[PDB]
């Protein structure tokens, strides 16, 4: 009878429990201690000013109402029981479409320790907003965020606090960089307070710092443009009588630069201001003219 | 009769069954054996750094609670009973969007054996993330894996293995990709070590070797022949100024057109590749 006690504990655990009331309603401020392991920093979609991040999101609070005693010290809960307990309703302020994976079973886990400590692990992909300023395209560097916090619980009800020192509470896996275009440089985690029309909320931010690679635009736009300008200038070395020859240089080099500029600005998203590559293209076209 | 007899058999098995408890909760770990019948590998997208595969993913374990003697025949139960049993919390470590097909009913299998063995099958389309390195593109081999782990149970509670251990994965040799060709597949079982324990893991790794004849015919042949055509201007006599200018400058134009149309046809990979190096070489020669 080594499971009779286990099942008695599991059934008695949720007697007199109210999943509508946060732990310590009138007595404390619920302190959810967050922690994020970024398994892979997914692709940064330049067109949409978004970026995907696949994370293990661990939140640990204290529920005095689940203090049990028995032969076990740590007690696991299935998802059916995890839906019957109060859990922080964290969301991502800048998230667009986050997906929590449920294959083959919900990628969630909830543990309870004797003293009433709850640990909630989730695996989820967050497709968040990465507002970009491409004035230095393709030589731009971005610092775009992952801000998350609580919905419906102001700063006086639920206060998030990173588990260890802010910068050791968000970690990116070694092979987690799934970016083929940028170079994840570093990360700055911080905590702040946001004031809205509904109250004051705790917000846990994590800026990921990205630097764009240049080696592709170099050999794909810059060198073709430079060679086209050099070729246009080389027309001066031909003798003057060869009017058809020099005219053909002029016009066909204009056509090549037209094609190159069209292709480069096809590669760039459809921003409404001049980038560094755009200035280079403009000056090159002026040179050929 | 027989029909009722089995009705009471299954009802008795399920009455007083605690889904929250794994097989042999207080005892040795439960061993789960896995098969995969790869139905298809659909799309290997270099832009999204992912591939898609449809499989018949099967697991088999022992659940002494689900043991019966009063019938000999292998029981096969309606999939809706898989909700009332314990099934391992396996998850695919590198997937992005996965789903079990649900037409005409939820595509899964639950099959009990008289000795307690439980077989549990799903029909899954998983979009796995395949890290890629296309420096050598299009002359590159891409090792695309699928990693299977257990979320909550450690090796002290659950153990993973391939059922058969070398034939566990079938249907792979019959996969006909449009752009690649499976040259080998490996099965690797292991126990990975993390902070709070060691978790089991299996790994199905394909090596995809990209077919080259297309890329030859479409990208290299035009560029090589345009380089030769540019050379043609040398046999044209020095006086033929308009002729040699036409030839050379039009060859530059054609090389630019080829480059800027392959830039679109080819997957948008914003780092430098071997194909780009070759096109740059031909351009520099013109």
């Amino acid at each position: 009878d080594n499971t009779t006690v286990f099942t008695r504990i599991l059934d008695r655990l949720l007697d007199g429990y109210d999943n509508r009331l946060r732990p310590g309603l009138g007595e404390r401020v619920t302190e959810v201690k967050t922690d994020i392991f970024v398994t892979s920093f997914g692709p940064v979609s330049d067109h949409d000013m978004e970026y995907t991040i696949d994370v293990f999101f661990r939140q640990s609070w204290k529920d005095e109402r689940l203090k049990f005693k028995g032969p076990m010290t740590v007690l696991r809960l299935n998802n059916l029981m995890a839906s019957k307990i109060w859990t922080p309703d964290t969301f991502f302020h800048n998230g667009k479409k986050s997906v929590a994976h449920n294959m083959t079973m919900p990628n969630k886990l909830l543990r309870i320790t004797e003293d009433g400590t709850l640990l909630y692990t989730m695996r989820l992909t967050v497709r968040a907003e990465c507002p970009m300023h491409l004035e230095d395209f393709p030589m731009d560097a971005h610092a775009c965020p992952l801000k998350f916090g609580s919905y419906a619980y102001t700063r006086a009800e639920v206060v998030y606090e990173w588990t260890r020192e802010p910068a050791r509470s968000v970690v990116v896996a070694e092979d987690g960089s799934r970016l083929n275009q940028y170079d994840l440089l570093g990360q700055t985690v911080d905590s702040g307070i946001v004031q809205s029309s509904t109250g004051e909320y705790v917000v846990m931010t994590t800026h990921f710092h990205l630097k764009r690679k240049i080696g592709y635009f170099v050999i794909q736009t810059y060198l073709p443009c430079i060679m086209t300008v050099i070729l246009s200038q080389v027309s001066f070395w031909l003798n003057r009588e060869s009017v058809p020859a020099r005219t053909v240089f002029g016009v066909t080099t204009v056509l090549t630069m037209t094609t190159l500029s069209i292709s480069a600005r096809n590669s760039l998203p459809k921003v409404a201001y001049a980038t560094a590559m755009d200035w280079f293209i403009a000056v090159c076209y002026a040179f050929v003219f | 009769s027989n029909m009722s007899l089995v009705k009471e058999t299954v009802d008795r098995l399920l009455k007083g069954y605690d889904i929250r408890l794994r097989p042999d909760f207080g005892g040795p770990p439960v061993a789960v054996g896995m098969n995969i019948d790869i139905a298809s590998i659909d799309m290997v997208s270099e832009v999204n750094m992912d591939y898609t595969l449809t499989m018949y993913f099967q697991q088999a374990w022992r659940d002494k609670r689900l043991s019966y003697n009063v019938i000999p025949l292998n029981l096969t139960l309606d999939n809706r009973v898989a909700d009332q049993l314990w099934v391992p919390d396996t998850y695919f470590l590198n997937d992005k969007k996965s789903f079990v097909h649900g037409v005409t009913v939820k595509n899964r299998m639950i099959r009990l054996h008289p000795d307690g063995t439980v077989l549990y099958g799903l029909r899954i389309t998983t979009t796995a993330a395949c890290m890629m390195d296309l420096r050598r593109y299009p002359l590159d081999e891409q090792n695309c894996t699928l990693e299977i782990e257990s979320y909550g149970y450690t090796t002290d509670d659950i153990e993973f293995y391939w059922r058969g251990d070398d034939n566990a994965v079938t249907g792979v040799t019959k996969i006909e990709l449009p752009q690649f060709s499976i040259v080998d597949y490996k099965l690797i079982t292991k126990k990975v070590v993390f902070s709070t324990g060691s978790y089991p893991r299996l790994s199905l790794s394909f090596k995809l070797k990209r077919n080259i004849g297309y890329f030859i015919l479409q990208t290299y042949m035009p560029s090589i022949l345009i380089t030769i055509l540019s050379w043609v201007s040398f046999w044209i006599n020095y006086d033929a100024s308009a002729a040699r200018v036409a030839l050379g400058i039009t060859t530059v134009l054609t090389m630019t057109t080829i480059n800027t149309h392959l830039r679109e046809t080819l997957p948008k990979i914003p780092y430098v590749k071997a194909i780009d190096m070759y096109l740059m070489g031909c351009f520099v020669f013109v």
Partner: antibody, heavy 121, light 110 residues
């Protein structure tokens, strides 16, 4: 990786004491520096930690208002300053590096380099 | 706060086991690590994460954790293992707290 530490010190009760811990062989800012005391007659005790990157500190409960663990990134030293000395403060003060691993399933901490170094009152 | 035997003993060859017992907020939640201390010198790391072994410590040593208790099993006990053995486990009752055990003086009979 080593945590070469200051020489012995002798002082009379009530006089602030200084101990220093120069680290070499590892990026001094990546890992943390925990100070562990050890009285000759009894077992180990944890004085407190400090992150060499943020300066964040965690002095133990029994030394909440008696310690000052600062750190000098330039020369990669972390020197503790115990104050309000007493007769029970005589012990070998060790400098340890709190190596740490974090991954999917939580954290796990330990102290691999360790050091030496003493003080008597 | 962690409590372990004041001292243990074992004849050479015999497998002796030192144990630590603590509340659920340090060992029940975190991983222990064991620290040998040869007589008079500075303690060294012997086991971390309760199972892993630092490069240098022979496979002879092995640790385990069961619920709220930990055990260091010194198989094939030899003479040079005569030392103190402590166990540490970071506590979750405050953001930075690590609690050492009392320590165990292990002696080699003979």
């Amino acid at each position: 990786v080593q945590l070469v530490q200051s020489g012995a010190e002798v002082k009379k009760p009530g006089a602030s004491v200084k101990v220093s811990c120069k680290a070499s062989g590892y990026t001094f800012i990546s890992y943390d520096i925990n100070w562990v005391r050890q009285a000759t007659g009894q077992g180990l005790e944890w004085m407190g930690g400090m992150d060499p990157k943020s300066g964040n500190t965690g002095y133990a409960q029994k030394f909440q208002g008696r310690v000052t663990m600062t750190t000098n990134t330039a020369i990669s030293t972390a020197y503790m300053e115990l104050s309000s000395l007493r007769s029970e403060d005589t012990a070998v003060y060790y400098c340890v590096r709190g190596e740490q691993s974090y991954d999917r399933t939580g954290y796990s901490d330990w102290f691999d380099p360790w050091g030496q170094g003493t003080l008597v009152t | 706060v962690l409590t372990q035997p004041p001292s243990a003993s074992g004849t050479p060859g015999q497998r002796v086991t030192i144990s630590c017992s603590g509340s659920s907020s340090n060992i029940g939640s975190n991983t222990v690590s064991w620290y040998q201390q040869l007589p008079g010198t500075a303690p060294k790391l012997l086991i971390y994460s309760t199972n892993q072994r630092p490069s240098g410590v022979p496979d002879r040593f092995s640790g385990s954790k069961s619920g709220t208790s930990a055990s260091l099993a010194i198989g094939g006990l030899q003479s040079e293992d005569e030392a103190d053995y402590y166990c540490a486990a970071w506590d979750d009752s405050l953001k930075r707290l690590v609690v050492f055990g009392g320590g165990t003086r292990l002696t080699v009979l003979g």
